[PDB]
Structure 1
Amino acid sequence: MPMQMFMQVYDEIQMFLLEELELKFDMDPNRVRYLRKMMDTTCLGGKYNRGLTVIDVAESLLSLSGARRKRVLHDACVCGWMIEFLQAHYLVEDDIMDNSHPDVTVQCAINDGLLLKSWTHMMAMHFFADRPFLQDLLCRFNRVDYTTAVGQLYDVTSMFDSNDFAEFTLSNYKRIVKYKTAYYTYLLPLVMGLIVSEALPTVDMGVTEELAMLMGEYFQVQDDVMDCFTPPERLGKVGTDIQDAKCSWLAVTFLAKASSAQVAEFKANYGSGDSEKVATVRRLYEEADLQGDYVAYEAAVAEQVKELIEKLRLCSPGFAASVETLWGKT
């Protein structure tokens, strides 16, 4: 039911946006079908983890606060697609970076990124036009989007001096995860479910924020280990953190427990595209027993998560019963 309903609302949102362009923006059919194909290509196909969470939060809050049910669930579906379109916008922005007379493909990619972001506003301004939360929804959405761009700056420049391994620390790694990922992937869907369920001021936002940051940290650490050790045909992509000199959990944990000569061997091999230098880094990770530390670190984070949900149910029992699927889905 949630996935089926989420996909029906997608057709409703797409048709509004495309008809709006045809009827109010003077768009010709060729470009309308061009934009329908682009929207499907960039927004569909993922797992919809962020979008379906808005639904799951909304349905749990109308079970413990007729027509109010139908409207809230539909509102949650629009909010879910706002985040999905936002995610598609971020992915298109990423494709422009690694992809490299007017090159019309780079022009259209930049145009795609601007349209996907604007569509989050257009669908909000339309389907929520008569909602009292429309102004608060836009402000929280815009602020979280700003947060993500700030975290991208922290990530992209973690190895330099914005006009290097000093910023390879656990607290900075958490700062990167916090802003680059956790706020829009974990905090934003939860907040949006609360907004459409009219239960925003009824929850402890501090414990909510703290949970979202902890869950983003847990899933980024797992992502970092898989990026390095999971082979490409099983990970789904090519792990490139070592070559890209990312401030990953493996790097900052290694630098703390490595010897001075191992740090020199790591610093001399990190951030290179050569096959043997990357393998030299993986060898250092293995010999430092990092995957042994990975299990303990995740377990400790899991314990902080498995216990912070309890502080939240004492004032919001249904809300905490929506984050129940944080471990019904890893």
Structure 2
Amino acid sequence: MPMQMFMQVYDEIQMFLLEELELKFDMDPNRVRYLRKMMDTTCLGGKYNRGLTVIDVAESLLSLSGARRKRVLHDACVCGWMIEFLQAHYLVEDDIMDNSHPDVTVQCAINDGLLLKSWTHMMAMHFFADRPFLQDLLCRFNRVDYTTAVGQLYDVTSMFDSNDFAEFTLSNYKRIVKYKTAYYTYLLPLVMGLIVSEALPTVDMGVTEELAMLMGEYFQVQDDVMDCFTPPERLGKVGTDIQDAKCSWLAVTFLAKASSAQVAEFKANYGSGDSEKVATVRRLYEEADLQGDYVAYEAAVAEQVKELIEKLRLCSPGFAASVETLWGKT
């Protein structure tokens, strides 16, 4: 029922956006079908964890606050696709970076990125045109998107001086995770699920803001370890954090417990494409017993999570049930 309803609303949103282009933006059929295919390619195929979280939060709040049910659930589905389209927009922006007479494919990728973001506004301004929360919804949505771009700046420049390992600290690693990932992947679906369910001012946002960061941190640490040791056919991609000199959880944890000569060996091999230097970095990670620290670090975060949901249920009980399922996915 959740996934089945989420995909129906996708068809409704897609048909509106495409008919609008045809009827109000003078778009020819060839370009309409081209945009239908681009939308399907960039927005479908993932796991929809951000989008379904909006729905799951919405259904947990109409059970403990007829016509209001069907509307809030439809509003939740539109908000879920707003985040999925936003995620599609961020992924297209990422493809432009690593993919490289006018090059029409790079022009169309940039254009795709702009269209995907504008579509989040267009579907909100339509399906929520008569909702009182539309203005508060756009502001929080626009501010989270801004937060994510700030976090991408922190991430992309963590090894240089904005016109280097000084910013390879655990507090800065959390700053990157917080802004680049946590706010839009964990906080935004929760907040949107509370807005369409009218229960936004009925929750402790501090505990909510704190769980979102901790779940994002838990998720990103596991992602960093898998990027380095999970083989490509099992990970789904080629792990490239060592080559890209990323400020990963492995790197900042290694630097805190490495010897002076080992740090020199790490600094001399990090951020290179050579297969032996990357393997030297993985050798240092293994010999530093970083795996054993990974298990303990996640445990303490999980304890902070499994105990922070309790503060949230003292004043917002139904909310805490959905946050547990979101944590279960992580």
Q: TM-score range by the shorter chain?
A: over 0.9
- What do the CA deviations read for 1:21-78 (whole angstroms, capped 9, x no partner)? 0000000000000000000000000000000000000000000000000000000000
- TM, length-normalised to structure 1: 1.00
The alpha carbon displacement at 1:290 in A equals 0.2
Equivalent position SS for 1:327: helix
Q: Distance in 2 between matches of 1:193 and 1:86?
A: 16
Which contiguous aligned blocks of 4+ residues in structure 1 show a shift greater than 4 angstroms?
Answer: none
Q: Distance in 2 between matches of 1:192 and 1:110?
A: 27
Q: Distance in 1 between matches of 2:78 and 2:329?
A: 23
Q: Distance in 2 between matches of 1:327 and 1:91?
A: 23
Corresponding residue number in structure 2 for 1:218: 218
- Whether 1:121 and 2:97 are equivalent positions in the alignment is no
Corresponding residue number in structure 1 for 2:234: 234
The alpha carbon displacement at 1:328 in A equals 2.8
Q: Distance in 2 between matches of 1:327 and 1:202?
A: 21
Q: Distance in 1 between matches of 2:35 and 2:226?
A: 35
Q: Distance in 2 between matches of 1:17 and 1:23?
A: 10
Cα contact 2:215–2:327 (8 A) shared by 1: no
- What do the CA deviations read for 1:164-216 (whole angstroms, capped 9, x no partner)? 00000000000000000000000000000000000000000000000000000
Q: Distance in 1 between matches of 2:327 and 2:78?
A: 25
Q: Distance in 1 between matches of 2:264 and 2:324?
A: 44
The alpha carbon displacement at 1:324 in A equals 1.5
Task: Give matches, 1:1-330, under 5 Å.
Answer: 1-330=1-330
The alpha carbon displacement at 1:326 in A equals 2.9
Q: Distance in 1 between matches of 2:109 and 2:274?
A: 30
Q: Distance in 2 between matches of 1:52 and 1:218?
A: 20
Q: Distance in 1 between matches of 2:138 and 2:108?
A: 26
The alpha carbon displacement at 1:329 in A equals 1.8
Work out the percentage of aligned pairs sharing the same amino acid.
100
Cα contact 2:53–2:326 (8 A) shared by 1: no
- What do the CA deviations read for 1:260-290 (whole angstroms, capped 9, x no partner)? 0000000000000000000000000000000
Q: Distance in 1 between matches of 2:90 and 2:131?
A: 27
> CA 1:137–1:327 in structure 2 vs 1: closer, same or farther (change >3 Å)?
closer
Q: Distance in 1 between matches of 2:47 and 2:14?
A: 19
Q: Distance in 1 between matches of 2:65 and 2:182?
A: 27
Q: CA RMSD in A?
A: 0.4
- What do the CA deviations read for 1:242-268 (whole angstroms, capped 9, x no partner)? 000000000000000000000000000
The alpha carbon displacement at 1:145 in A equals 0.2
Give structure 1 stretches of 5+ with no counterpart. Answer: none
The alpha carbon displacement at 1:116 in A equals 0.1
Equivalent position SS for 1:322: helix
- What do the CA deviations read for 1:78-120 (whole angstroms, capped 9, x no partner)? 0000000000000000000000000000000000000000000
Cα contact 2:147–2:179 (8 A) shared by 1: yes
Q: Distance in 1 between matches of 2:255 and 2:321?
A: 39
Q: Distance in 2 between matches of 1:94 and 1:164?
A: 23
Q: Distance in 1 between matches of 2:179 and 2:326?
A: 20
Q: Distance in 2 between matches of 1:329 and 1:232?
A: 22
- TM, length-normalised to structure 2: 1.00
Equivalent position SS for 2:306: helix
Q: Distance in 1 between matches of 2:167 and 2:67?
A: 52
Equivalent position SS for 1:328: helix
Q: Distance in 2 between matches of 1:303 and 1:326?
A: 15
Q: Distance in 2 between matches of 1:299 and 1:48?
A: 26
The alpha carbon displacement at 1:327 in A equals 3.8
Equivalent position SS for 1:218: helix
Equivalent position SS for 1:321: helix
- What do the CA deviations read for 1:129-183 (whole angstroms, capped 9, x no partner)? 0000000000000000000000000000000000000000000000000000000
Equivalent position SS for 1:57: helix
Q: Distance in 2 between matches of 1:63 and 1:302?
A: 27
Give structure 2 stretches of 5+ with no counterpart. Answer: none
Equivalent position SS for 2:27: coil
Q: Distance in 1 between matches of 2:262 and 2:322?
A: 45
